[PDB]
Amino acid sequence: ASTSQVRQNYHQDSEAAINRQINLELYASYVYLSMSYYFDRDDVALKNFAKYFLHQSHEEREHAEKLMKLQNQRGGRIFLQDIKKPDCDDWESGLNAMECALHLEKNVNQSLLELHKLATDKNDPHLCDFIETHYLNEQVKAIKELGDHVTNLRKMGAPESGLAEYLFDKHTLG
Amino acid sequence: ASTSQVRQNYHQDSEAAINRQINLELYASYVYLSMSYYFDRDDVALKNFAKYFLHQSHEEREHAEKLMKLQNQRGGRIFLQDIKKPDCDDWESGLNAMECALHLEKNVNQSLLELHKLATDKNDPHLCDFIETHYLNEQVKAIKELGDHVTNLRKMGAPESGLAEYLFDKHTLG
Amino acid sequence: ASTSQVRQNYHQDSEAAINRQINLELYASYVYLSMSYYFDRDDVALKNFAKYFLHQSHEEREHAEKLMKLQNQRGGRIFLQDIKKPDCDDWESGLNAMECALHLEKNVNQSLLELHKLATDKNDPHLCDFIETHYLNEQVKAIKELGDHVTNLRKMGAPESGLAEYLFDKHTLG
Amino acid sequence: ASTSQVRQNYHQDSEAAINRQINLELYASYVYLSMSYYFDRDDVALKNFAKYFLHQSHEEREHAEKLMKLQNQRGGRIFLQDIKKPDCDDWESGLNAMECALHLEKNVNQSLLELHKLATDKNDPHLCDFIETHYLNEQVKAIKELGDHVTNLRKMGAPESGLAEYLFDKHTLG
Amino acid sequence: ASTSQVRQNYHQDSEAAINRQINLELYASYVYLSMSYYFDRDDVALKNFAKYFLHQSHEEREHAEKLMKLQNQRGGRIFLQDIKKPDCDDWESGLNAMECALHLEKNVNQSLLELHKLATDKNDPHLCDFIETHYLNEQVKAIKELGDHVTNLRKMGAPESGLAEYLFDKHTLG
Amino acid sequence: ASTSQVRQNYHQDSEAAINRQINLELYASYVYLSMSYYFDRDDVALKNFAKYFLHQSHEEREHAEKLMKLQNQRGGRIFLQDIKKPDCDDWESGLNAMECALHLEKNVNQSLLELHKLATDKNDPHLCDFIETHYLNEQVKAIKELGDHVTNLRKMGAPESGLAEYLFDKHTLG
Ligand SMILES: [Cl-]
Ligand SMILES: [Cl-]
Ligand SMILES: [Cl-]
Ligand SMILES: [Cl-]
Ligand SMILES: [Cl-]
Ligand SMILES: [Cl-]
Ligand SMILES: [Cl-]
Ligand SMILES: [Cl-]
Ligand SMILES: [Cl-]
Ligand SMILES: [Cl-]
Ligand SMILES: [Cl-]
Ligand SMILES: [Cl-]
Ligand SMILES: [Cl-]
Ligand SMILES: [Cl-]
Ligand SMILES: [Cl-]
Ligand SMILES: [Cl-]
Ligand SMILES: [Cl-]
Ligand SMILES: [Cl-]
Ligand SMILES: [Cl-]
Ligand SMILES: [Cl-]
Ligand SMILES: [Cl-]
Ligand SMILES: [Cl-]
Ligand SMILES: [Cl-]
Ligand SMILES: [Cl-]
Ligand SMILES: [Cl-]
Ligand SMILES: [Cl-]
Ligand SMILES: [Cl-]
Ligand SMILES: [Cl-]
Ligand SMILES: [Cl-]
Ligand SMILES: [Cl-]
Ligand SMILES: [Cl-]
Ligand SMILES: [Cl-]
Ligand SMILES: [Cl-]
Ligand SMILES: [Cl-]
Ligand SMILES: [Cl-]
Ligand SMILES: [Cl-]
Ligand SMILES: [Cl-]
Ligand SMILES: [Cl-]
Ligand SMILES: [Cl-]
Ligand SMILES: [Cl-]
Ligand SMILES: [Cl-]
Ligand SMILES: [Cl-]
Ligand SMILES: [Cl-]
Ligand SMILES: [Cl-]
Ligand SMILES: [Cl-]
Ligand SMILES: [Cl-]
Ligand SMILES: [Cl-]
Ligand SMILES: [Cl-]
Ligand SMILES: [Cl-]
Ligand SMILES: [Cl-]
Ligand SMILES: [Fe+3]
Ligand SMILES: [Fe+3]
Ligand SMILES: [Fe+3]
Ligand SMILES: [Fe+3]
Ligand SMILES: [Fe+3]
Ligand SMILES: [Fe+3]
Ligand SMILES: [Mg+2]
Ligand SMILES: [Mg+2]
Ligand SMILES: [Mg+2]
Ligand SMILES: [Mg+2]
Ligand SMILES: [Mg+2]
Ligand SMILES: [Mg+2]
Ligand SMILES: [Mg+2]
Ligand SMILES: [Mg+2]
Ligand SMILES: [Mg+2]
Ligand SMILES: [Mg+2]
Ligand SMILES: [Mg+2]
Ligand SMILES: [Mg+2]
Ligand SMILES: [Mg+2]
Ligand SMILES: [Mg+2]
Ligand SMILES: [Mg+2]
Ligand SMILES: [Mg+2]
Ligand SMILES: [Mg+2]
Ligand SMILES: [Mg+2]
Ligand SMILES: [Mg+2]
Ligand SMILES: [Mg+2]
Ligand SMILES: [Mg+2]
Ligand SMILES: [Mg+2]
Ligand SMILES: [Mg+2]
Ligand SMILES: [Mg+2]
Ligand SMILES: [Mg+2]
Ligand SMILES: [Mg+2]
Ligand SMILES: [Mg+2]
Ligand SMILES: [Mg+2]
Ligand SMILES: [Mg+2]
Ligand SMILES: [Mg+2]
Ligand SMILES: [Mg+2]
Ligand SMILES: [Mg+2]
Ligand SMILES: [Mg+2]
Ligand SMILES: [Mg+2]
Ligand SMILES: [Mg+2]
Ligand SMILES: [Mg+2]
Ligand SMILES: [Mg+2]
Ligand SMILES: [Mg+2]
Ligand SMILES: [Mg+2]
Ligand SMILES: [Mg+2]
Ligand SMILES: [Mg+2]
Ligand SMILES: [Mg+2]
Ligand SMILES: [Mg+2]
Ligand SMILES: [Mg+2]
Ligand SMILES: [Mg+2]
Ligand SMILES: [Mg+2]
Ligand SMILES: [Mg+2]
Ligand SMILES: [Mg+2]
Ligand SMILES: [Mg+2]
Ligand SMILES: [Mg+2]
Ligand SMILES: [Mg+2]
Ligand SMILES: [Mg+2]
C-alpha cells in the first residue's frame, strides 16, 4: 500500500493512464503482427508489405517497454490487462491494411494527446516532456508516412490493380 | 473457403493446434515481460533478473513468429485470440519468479508434446520434424536451465536471503 | 547376391523405393532444364525465368546424387531407369511454367511422404531422419515459393499481360 | 509453324541433328553418373575414381546446355527425348569403367564428326566453327586422357591387381 | 527418491536404456584405445592406424559424455557400471582390426536402434530426435567408412601382404 | 613368446607394474567423469565444479595413454583389465567430492612411489626418470591444489553453506 521511495509529483490518475497506454501499445504491436503475416500468405505474397508491418510491430513493443520503464522510474506500479485480438475486418489488400494502420496510428495519437492533457492538468512537466520527446513526433511522422503510402497506392490504382500493389511493394517498401 | 494451392498432408486439426500454440507462445512472451519489469521496480532492483526475463520474452515472440510462418508455409490460416494477462500470483522474489518460469516452460513443453502426438496421429512427418528441430530441445534446455537456477537460489538461502538473490543476479545472470 | 557388409535395418522395399525416388529427382531435373531453355527462346526472351529454372534443375540433380550416396551408405544397390522426357504441355507462358513447377514439386513431395510412410512401417529411423532433414522442409519451402510466384503473376495480370511477366522477371527473379 | 525472326542459314536437318546431339550428351552425363556411384559402393570403395567420373558427368551436362543455347541462338526449337539408362555391362573394375568411358567418348566424337559433315554439306560455317571450337578438341583431349588411363591400369596389372587400381586412384586420380 | 523438478515425459525404462548406452560407448572407447596401441608396438609399427583408432577412441568418449549430459537434461540419474576390457581376439593385422571395428560399430548401431524403438514405444519425441540427430547418421557414416577400409585392404592383398597394410597406412590413413 | 627387438634393461616385474598403473589411471579418469556429471545434475547445478572435474578426467586419460606409449617404447606388452566403476559413496557436496579427489590423487601417488621403488630395485634409471619427469611432481601439485580447495570450502562453511559452494564455484573454479 505505502508509497514508493522514488515517487514525487506523480498523480494516481497519471499512473493509471500510463497503464492504459501500455495496453494500447501492446495492442498496436499485435495488429501489426497480424497484418504482417497476412502478406506472407501464399495467396497474398507481398514480402515487403510483410517485412514493413513486422518492423512496425517490433517498434510498438519497444513503445510499450519504454512506458513500462517510465512507470517504474516514477514509482508507479504496472498493471497489465489482456491484449485484445486485432479488431479490424479481413485485411483484403495492401491498400486496406495501410488504411487500417493509418486509423490505428491516429487512435494511438489521440490516446497520447489525452495523456498529455492529463499530465498538463496535474502539473507534471516530466511526464509532458516524456510524451513529447518519445511519442508525439514519432506519431506525427508515422501518420504522415502512412498517409503518403495510402495516397500512392490509390493513385497507382489499388486495390483493383494487383500490379499497383506489386510495384509499390518493390519500389517503396523494398 | 476453397483450398490453398500449397496445402498437402496438413490436417485441419493440426492447423487448429498450431493456432493454439501461437497463442500460448505469445502468452509466454507476456508472462516474461511482466516478470522482467517486476525486477526493474525501485523496491526489487535486480537488473540482471530484469534483463534475463526480457530476453526470454523476446525469444517467446520469435517462437510465435516461426509458428505463424509455418502456418502459412503449409497453407493453413492464422487465427488469433486475445493474449491473456499473466495469471501467476504476486512475483514476490527472484526464486518465486524462476519457479513460475519453470512451471510456464513445462506447460509449454506439454502443449508441444500434445502437438507432436497429433502430428504423429495424422502421419505429418514435416510437422513432427518442425516441432523436434525448432521446439522440443529448446524446451528441454530451457527447463534444465531454470531448474539449475531454482536449485542455486534455494541452496544460497533465497528467498529470505536478499544477499543470495543479489549475488545470484551478479554471478549467474550478469 | 550375398549381403553388403554395411547393411543393417535396411529393408529391400526401402532400397527399391529409394531407386524410384532417384529416378523422380532426375526427371524433375529434366523438366526444369526444358522449362529453362523455353525462356531462352528468342520469341519468349525472359532471361531471369531461364536462370531461375536452370538453378532449380541443378538443385534436383543434387537431390538425386544425395539419394545415390544414401543408397550406398546403407548397403543397397542403385538401379537406374530411363529418365522420361518432360510430360507437360507446351510451356506457353511464365505463369503456366510456374504452375507446372508447383504441380511437379507437389508430386515429388507426395512421393517423399510415401517413402517416409514406408520407412516408418519398416521401423527405419535413420531413413526417416534422412528424408526429414534433407527433403521434406526443402519441398515445403519450394512449394510455398512457387505458390507465391503463381499468386503474384496472376495478380499482375499474366498470362495476357506480357508487361506483367516482363516486370516479374526483373523484380522477383532478377 | 512460321519462321523464327533470328533464323538464317540454319537447315532443318542441322536443327534435328543438334537435338540428337543434345540427347547423346545427356546420355553420356548419365553413364558417368552411374560409373561414379559404382566406385562409391562399400565393396568397390575407390573415392577418386568416384570423383573423376562425377566431374566427367557434370561436364557432359554443360556440353548439353551449350547445345541447347546454340539451338535457340540459331532460331531452332529444342526437342527432347527420353535419356536412356546406361547400356554398359556390370562396371566390374576401374579398368573396365575406363575402357567403357573411352568407348563412350569415341562414340560421342563420331556423332560430332557426322554433325560437322552435315554442317559442311549445308554450307553452315557458324555451326562448323561452333563444333570445332567447343567440342572437337575437347573430345580429342578426353579420348587421349582415357587412353592414357587405360594404358597405365593395364601396365600396373589391373584388373586382377586390386593394389594397381588402389594406387592409380591415389597417384593419377588423387 | 522423489521426482526431479525438470523431468517430463521421460520413462524409467528410457532412463535405464540411456545408462546402458553410456556403458557401451565407454566400452567402444576402450576397444579403440586397445587397437590404437597395438599399432604402436615395435613389431606392428603402423603409426597412422595407431592415430586413426586413437581418434575413434576419443570420439566414443565424446559420445558417452553427450549421453551423460542428456540423462541430466531430462532429469534421469546416471548409473555407471564397470567398463569391460576389450573382448576381441589378438588384434593380428590392420585388416583384422578394421573388421573388429566394423563389428563393434554395427553392434553399437543395433543398441541405438533398440533405444530408438523404446523411445518410440514410450512416445518420447525429444529422445527420438536426440538419437537421430547425434547418433544414427554418425553410425551409418562410421560403418560405411570401415566397410570401405576393409574392402580396400582385402583388394590390396592384406593381411598376407605387409606391403598392402604399409601403403594403406600412408595413402588412406595418412 | 620370444623377446622384443627393442627390449633392454626392462624387468618383467616393471612391465606388469606399468600395466597395473595404466588401469589405475583409467580408473581415476572414470572417477572424475562421474564426479563431473554429479555437478551437472539439476539438483546440484555447480557448472564450474562440473568443468573442473571433466578437465581432471581428460588429464587422467592422457596419463594412461603416456604409460601405454612407455610400455611399447620399452618393448613390454600392454595388458588391459576392466575399469571398475567409481567406488566412492554418494558424491553429496562440492566439499565431499574435493575430499574424495584428494584421497584418489594420494592413492595414485602411493602407487607411483611403489612403481619407482620397484624401478630403483631393478636398476632401471630410464623408468625412474620417466616416473619423476611425467608423474611425481604432477601428483604433488594435484594434491596441494586439492588440499587448498578442501581448506577454502571448509573455511567458507561448506557443506552446510550452499552459498559457500556457489561462491567457490564462481571465484576459484570460474
Ligand atoms: Cl506523488
Ligand atoms: Cl495522487
Ligand atoms: Cl484483464
Ligand atoms: Cl470485450
Ligand atoms: Cl506542468
Ligand atoms: Cl521523434
Ligand atoms: Cl521531424
Ligand atoms: Cl515526415
Ligand atoms: Cl491437406
Ligand atoms: Cl483435414
Ligand atoms: Cl479472442
Ligand atoms: Cl477467462
Ligand atoms: Cl508420420
Ligand atoms: Cl535446440
Ligand atoms: Cl543439447
Ligand atoms: Cl543443457
Ligand atoms: Cl538389413
Ligand atoms: Cl528385407
Ligand atoms: Cl529402364
Ligand atoms: Cl511409357
Ligand atoms: Cl522407426
Ligand atoms: Cl530445409
Ligand atoms: Cl523453414
Ligand atoms: Cl518459406
Ligand atoms: Cl534458315
Ligand atoms: Cl531448311
Ligand atoms: Cl521420347
Ligand atoms: Cl529401346
Ligand atoms: Cl561452309
Ligand atoms: Cl579445346
Ligand atoms: Cl590441345
Ligand atoms: Cl592431351
Ligand atoms: Cl516423467
Ligand atoms: Cl516411468
Ligand atoms: Cl558394475
Ligand atoms: Cl562377465
Ligand atoms: Cl513419439
Ligand atoms: Cl551426422
Ligand atoms: Cl550424410
Ligand atoms: Cl559416407
Ligand atoms: Cl606408393
Ligand atoms: Cl630386458
Ligand atoms: Cl625379467
Ligand atoms: Cl579383466
Ligand atoms: Cl571386485
Ligand atoms: Cl638405477
Ligand atoms: Cl611437473
Ligand atoms: Cl613445481
Ligand atoms: Cl603448487
Ligand atoms: Cl562475491
Ligand atoms: Fe506506439
Ligand atoms: Fe516458446
Ligand atoms: Fe527434388
Ligand atoms: Fe560431351
Ligand atoms: Fe559411439
Ligand atoms: Fe594420473
Ligand atoms: Mg485501452
Ligand atoms: Mg510505427
Ligand atoms: Mg498504488
Ligand atoms: Mg473479444
Ligand atoms: Mg481497419
Ligand atoms: Mg521538450
Ligand atoms: Mg523531439
Ligand atoms: Mg524514440
Ligand atoms: Mg523529435
Ligand atoms: Mg491456449
Ligand atoms: Mg526461453
Ligand atoms: Mg480453412
Ligand atoms: Mg481475465
Ligand atoms: Mg507461478
Ligand atoms: Mg520421427
Ligand atoms: Mg529430426
Ligand atoms: Mg536439434
Ligand atoms: Mg531455433
Ligand atoms: Mg537441437
Ligand atoms: Mg517414377
Ligand atoms: Mg527447387
Ligand atoms: Mg540386392
Ligand atoms: Mg514416352
Ligand atoms: Mg504442367
Ligand atoms: Mg531441418
Ligand atoms: Mg539440404
Ligand atoms: Mg530444416
Ligand atoms: Mg541418339
Ligand atoms: Mg570429359
Ligand atoms: Mg520448326
Ligand atoms: Mg531400355
Ligand atoms: Mg562398356
Ligand atoms: Mg580450340
Ligand atoms: Mg569449352
Ligand atoms: Mg582448342
Ligand atoms: Mg552393455
Ligand atoms: Mg567413430
Ligand atoms: Mg530414479
Ligand atoms: Mg572379464
Ligand atoms: Mg573382433
Ligand atoms: Mg542429421
Ligand atoms: Mg554430433
Ligand atoms: Mg546428419
Ligand atoms: Mg589396480
Ligand atoms: Mg589432475
Ligand atoms: Mg612378455
Ligand atoms: Mg564391482
Ligand atoms: Mg571418497
Ligand atoms: Mg635418481
Ligand atoms: Mg620436472
Ligand atoms: Mg607432463
Ligand atoms: Mg617438474
Q: Where are the domains of chain F?
A: 3-174
Residues F40, F97 contacting (CB under 8 angstroms): no
Q: How far is the CA of A49 from the centre of ligand 7 (A)?
A: 24
Q: Do chains B and E touch (3 or more CB pairs under 8 A)?
A: yes
**Residue that the C-alpha cell 513493443 belongs to:** A61
Q: Which of E129, E132, E134 to mutate to test the interface with B (most CBs of B within 10 A)?
A: E129
CB-based contact, D122 to chain C, within 8 Å: no
Backbone phi and psi for residue F120, each to the nearest 5 degrees, phi listed first: -65, -45
How far does Cα B121 stand from its chain's mean position? Answer: 25
Tell me which chains share at least 3 CB pairs under 8 Å with chain A.
Answer: B, C
Residues B76, B10 contacting (CB under 8 angstroms): yes
Structure determined by: X-ray
CATH of span D3-174: 1.20.1260.10
Residues B139, B112 contacting (CB under 8 angstroms): yes
Q: Do B136 and E123 touch (CB under 8 A)?
A: no
CB-based contact, C106 to chain A, within 8 Å: no
Residues A46, A165 contacting (CB under 8 angstroms): yes
Q: Do B116 and E125 touch (CB under 8 A)?
A: yes
User: Which chain D residues contact residue C54 at CB under 8 A?
Assistant: 65
Give SS3 for B83: strand
CB-based contact, E114 to chain C, within 8 Å: no
| Nearest chain B CA: its distance from E97 CA (Å) | 37
Residues F57, F33 contacting (CB under 8 angstroms): yes
Backbone phi and psi for residue D28, each to the nearest 5 degrees, phi listed first: -60, -40
Residues D126, D69 contacting (CB under 8 angstroms): no
Ligand nearest to the CA of B120: 13
Give SS3 for F83: strand
Backbone phi and psi for residue F89, each to the nearest 5 degrees, phi listed first: -50, 175
Breaks (C-N over 2.5 A) in chain A follow: none
CB-based contact, E120 to chain B, within 8 Å: no
- CA atoms lying within 13 Å on the CB side of residue D162: 19
Dihedral over Cα of B159, B164, B167, B173: its sign: negative
Give SS3 for B149: helix
Using alpha carbons, select from C33, F13, F168 the residue that is nearest to residue B171.
Answer: F168
Q: Do B156 and F166 touch (CB under 8 A)?
A: yes
Q: Which of D2, D20, D32, D43 to mutate to test the interface with C (most CBs of C within 10 A)?
A: D43
Residues B21, B60 contacting (CB under 8 angstroms): no
Q: Do D5 and C43 touch (CB under 8 A)?
A: yes
**Which helix or strand (DSSP H or E) is residue C33 part of?**
helix C12-39
- CA atoms lying within 13 Å on the CB side of residue D15: 15
CB-based contact, E107 to chain B, within 8 Å: no
Closest Cβ–Cβ partner in C30, C34, C78 for D37: C78
Q: How far is the CA of A141 from the centre of ligand 7 (A)?
A: 7
Q: Quote the CA–CA distance of F46 and B75 in Å, as a whole number.
A: 47
How far does Cα B81 stand from its chain's mean position? Answer: 17
Closest Cβ–Cβ partner in C137, C144, C151 for B129: C137
User: Which chain B residues contact residue A34 at CB under 8 A?
Assistant: 78, 80
Could you report how far apart the first and last alpha carbons of chain A are, in Å? Answer: 52
Q: Do B137 and E123 touch (CB under 8 A)?
A: no
Q: Quote the CA–CA distance of E109 and E100 in Å, as a whole number.
A: 14
Give SS3 for E83: strand
Residues C116, B126 contacting (CB under 8 angstroms): no
Q: Which three cell numbers stand for residue D157?
A: 596389372
**Residue that the C-alpha cell 526429414 belongs to:** C132
Total beta-carbon pairs less than 8 A apart between chain B and chain E: 41
CB-based contact, D61 to chain C, within 8 Å: yes
Q: Do chains F and C touch (3 or more CB pairs under 8 A)?
A: no
Residue D15, judged by CB atoms within 10 A of its CB (0-12, 13-18, 19+), counts as: middle
CB-based contact, B151 to chain A, within 8 Å: no
* Cited resolution, angstroms: 1.5
Q: Provide, for chain F, the percentages of residues in helix, strand and coil under a 3-state DSSP scheme, each rounded to the nearest 5.
A: 70, 0, 30
Q: Quote the CA–CA distance of A34 and C49 in Å, as a whole number.
A: 32
Q: Do F68 and E37 touch (CB under 8 A)?
A: yes
Q: What is the 3-state secondary structure (H, E, C) of chain C?
A: CCCCCCCCCCCHHHHHHHHHHHHHHHHHHHHHHHHHHHHCCCCCCCHHHHHHHHHHHHHHHHHHHHHHHHHHHCCCCCCCCCECCCCCCCCCCHHHHHHHHHHHHHHHHHHHHHHHHHHHHCCCHHHHHHHHHHHHHHHHHHHHHHHHHHHHHHHHCCCCCHHHHHHHHHHCCC
Q: What is the 3-state secondary structure (H, E, C) of chain A?
A: CCCCCCCCCCCHHHHHHHHHHHHHHHHHHHHHHHHHHHHCCCCCCCHHHHHHHHHHHHHHHHHHHHHHHHHHHCCCCCCCCCECCCCCCCCCCHHHHHHHHHHHHHHHHHHHHHHHHHHHHCCCHHHHHHHHHHHHHHHHHHHHHHHHHHHHHHHHCCCCCHHHHHHHHHHCCC
Q: How far is the CA of A81 from the centre of ligand 1 (A)?
A: 24
Give SS3 for B45: coil
Q: Which three cell numbers stand for residue A88?
A: 479490424
Nearest CA in chain A to C166: A163
| Nearest chain F CA: its distance from E123 CA (Å) | 23
Closest Cβ–Cβ partner in D4, D68, D82 for C83: D82
CB-based contact, B77 to chain F, within 8 Å: no
D132 is in an annotated binding site: no
- CA atoms lying within 13 Å on the CB side of residue C107: 12
Q: Which three cell numbers stand for residue D33?
A: 553418373
How far does Cα A18 stand from its chain's mean position? Answer: 15
CB-based contact, E8 to chain C, within 8 Å: no
CB-based contact, B149 to chain E, within 8 Å: no
Residue A12, judged by CB atoms within 10 A of its CB (0-12, 13-18, 19+), counts as: exposed
Q: Do C8 and E136 touch (CB under 8 A)?
A: no
Q: Quote the CA–CA distance of C43 and B12 in Å, as a whole number.
A: 45
Question: What single letter denotes the amino acid at residue C134?
Answer: H
Using alpha carbons, select from C65, C36, F68, B72 the residue that is nearest to residue A42.
Answer: B72
Residues A88, A31 contacting (CB under 8 angstroms): yes
Closest Cβ–Cβ partner in B152, B161, B171 for F45: B152
Q: Quote the CA–CA distance of A80 and A16 in Å, as a whole number.
A: 11
Q: How far is the CA of E84 from the centre of ligand 100 (A)?
A: 14
Q: Do chains E and A touch (3 or more CB pairs under 8 A)?
A: no
Q: Which three cell numbers stand for residue B141?
A: 534446455
**Residue that the C-alpha cell 531454470 belongs to:** B146
User: Which chain D residues contact residue C5 at CB under 8 A?
Assistant: 42-43
Q: Quote the CA–CA distance of D70 and D97 in Å, as a whole number.
A: 31
Residue F82, judged by CB atoms within 10 A of its CB (0-12, 13-18, 19+), counts as: middle
Q: Quote the CA–CA distance of A83 and A92 in Å, as a whole number.
A: 23
